[PDB]
């Protein structure tokens, strides 16, 4: 076939029931994740080709960046809880990897506030039940798929995208093939 198990994607030994249709794992403290998002724009490309009714979810991992990595995972939970993911993704990536302006939890807070989120609102969300739950969900999902590295993407909690098996003869062909594979897999 055009797409085959072993090439563009691998199948998980134990399928995760009730997992998000398309789950992506990343970290702001991850160089390849920066390229994946900010440079190559793999996510946006994948989203653009997803079938009707298929949604994409992005979880942050906590095993990178030490304590700040932990704080960034909770801050990401806040972003999801408040629905402001697309307002903070860029400043967080740039601030962490490019300009090196984000070095603590309070620096992260400044980023959200500058983005339009009121301080009280952020602080409320930070200590909320929804956020505590989200933090736990993110780590649990990573464990369910036996995640050891990011960036990574899973479809229907059964397939894992395998970039190493894709056509990497050109930056554009790679990106397009990645998006096409996710689309193909979600129709299963």
Curated annotation (Swiss-Prot):
Keyword entries, A-Z: Disulfide bond, Periplasm, Redox-active center, Signal
Domain Thioredoxin as annotated: residue spans: 1-131
MF (Gene Ontology): protein disulfide isomerase activity; protein-disulfide reductase activity
GO CC annotation terms, alphabetical: outer membrane-bounded periplasmic space
CDD domains the UniProt entry points to: DsbA_DsbA
Any one Gene Ontology BP term: cellular response to antibiotic
SUPFAM superfamilies assigned to the protein according to its UniProt record, in alphabetical order: Thioredoxin-like
Disulfide bonding pattern of the chain: 30-33
Compartments it resides in: Periplasm
A matching Pfam family: DSBA
KO phenotype (gene knockout): Induction of the PhoP/PhoQ two-component regulatory system, suppressed by 50 uM CuSO(4).
Domain of life: Bacteria
Location (main, coarse): periplasm
Function: Required for disulfide bond formation in some periplasmic proteins such as PhoA or OmpA. Acts by transferring its disulfide bond to other proteins and is reduced in the process. DsbA is reoxidized by DsbB. Required for pilus biogenesis. PhoP-regulated transcription is redox-sensitive, being activated when the periplasm becomes more reducing (deletion of dsbA/dsbB, treatment with dithiothreitol). MgrB acts between DsbA/DsbB and PhoP/PhoQ in this pathway.
Family, per entry: Belongs to the thioredoxin family. DsbA subfamily.
Name of the protein: Thiol:disulfide interchange protein DsbA
